[PDB]
From a paper:
The coronavirus spike (S) glycoprotein attaches to host receptors and mediates viral fusion. Using a broad screening approach, we isolated from [name] ([name]-[name]-2) immune donors seven monoclonal antibodies (mAbs) that bind to all human-infecting coronavirus S proteins. This class of mAbs recognize the fusion peptide and acquire affinity and breadth through somatic mutations. Structural and functional analyses show that the fusion peptide-specific mAbs bind with different modalities to a cryptic epitope, which is hidden in prefusion stabilized S, and becomes exposed upon binding of angiotensin-converting enzyme 2 ([name]) or [name]-mimicking mAbs.
Using [name]-[name]-2 S1, RBD and S2 proteins, as well as 15-mer linear peptides covering the entire S sequence, the specificities of all seven Group 3 mAbs were mapped to the K811PSKRSFIEDLLFNK825 sequence in the [name]-[name]-2 S2 subunit. All five Fabs bind to overlapping epitopes in the fusion peptide through interactions involving the heavy and light chains. The conserved residue R815, which is the S2’ site of proteolytic processing upon receptor binding for membrane fusion activation, is engaged in electrostatic interactions with the [name], VN01H1, VP12E7 and C77G12 Fabs and therefore buried at the interface with their paratopes. In contrast, the [name] UCA bound only to the beta hCoV OC43 and MERS-[name] S, whereas the VP12E7 UCA bound only to the alpha hCoV NL63 S, with low affinity in both cases.
Numbering used by the authors:
A (entry chain B): 2 to 212
B (entry chain A): 1 to 140, 147 to 229
C (entry chain D): 813 to 824
Write the structure that this text describes.
Amino acid sequence: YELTQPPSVSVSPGQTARITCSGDALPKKYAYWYQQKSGQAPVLVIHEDDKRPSGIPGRFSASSSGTTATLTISGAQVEDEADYYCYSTDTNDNHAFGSGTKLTVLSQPKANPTVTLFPPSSEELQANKATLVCLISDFYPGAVTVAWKADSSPVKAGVETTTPSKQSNNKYAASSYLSLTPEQWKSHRSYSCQVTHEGSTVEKTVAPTEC
Amino acid sequence: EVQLVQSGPEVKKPGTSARVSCKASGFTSKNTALQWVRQARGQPLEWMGWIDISNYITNYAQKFRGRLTITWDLSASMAYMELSSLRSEDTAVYYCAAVGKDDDVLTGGNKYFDHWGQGTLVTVSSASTKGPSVFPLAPSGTAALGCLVKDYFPEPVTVSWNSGALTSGVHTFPAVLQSSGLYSLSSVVTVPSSSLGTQTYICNVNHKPSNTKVDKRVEPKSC
Amino acid sequence: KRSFIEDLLFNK
């Protein structure tokens, strides 16, 4: 059973945030909503479609209509910044959490990411290894998608990416690695790291013949 | 008051079975279920299964059937999950949670309740203790440079720059666990381009579990 | 084979 949520939602302080959750069984099965902050267990914020737990502020509300459950946070506050998950089941008792939504309560203007792509160092090549390092920095909000290409071909194998971490300047940074063998590195014309942030894609490319 | 206390973190080799305990105190309502939910780094919550602790009826998610057992030991007030044939992708934080409804004698109605354990990190890796390799990330307004801290186990590693004298513009990333079962991280610093080649930049890497200390000088490239 | 809690928590 699959429950679909938008990956990220932005809301100005004091404005209303809406987070949707799409599931085929919601007309028959209750939706629950959970809030999760970094390093903490999730916390219930809505149970049984629209019921507010005793300790949850009155600005939290929710509803369910058709195949869509909606969590509404009126007058959003900085403390409401978190990941939000819906939760329900289907008519065959398959429980599921939704794909999750990162709610950013905007604290500054949008900042476009700066992308730096490092080729494998000669030291690592000497150790019979090769790692491309894609550094992504100074972006806000802290939601990005990273894709790797070799010779204009999408590369899924050997990729690891960190979740955006807050910089000291209050923007976000992230890192992505493409791990290859020295033979793989030399046997392709180019490699690209593609960073998408707020609907705009930034790309950096390196070539083994360059250095 | 009710309490949920999980067992501590554990490293498990691939192919073995992980057992996680959850002491559930104070749950006397007949309609109480103890569920298990896992979450890999940066990934969504994943419902694994639950047990009705009044009649021991279990419900396992389809993806875990044949590998997962959830048990309730009434005499010890202990819930367990056992996940067998562990793979690298099973590395995650595993949560227990108590859900259900109470007969609220105060108001005369019912109250849904929802409580969570602190979580248990299960790390699936065949690796032994291994110090990292430190490789320079050389630069060619401002310039970014750093050090790649590759293939170590277990966590953590600390990184400083120029023995702590350089702090501005520094960012050390969280580690990633690779398919090899080893961790890797990076630390970067943004510096003025005019300083490259004159100011020396050295990253100081400490991995206590392997008693490893590495100072790596990061030099600019001419190419 | 099926717990009542399934209906108690989800049946609308």
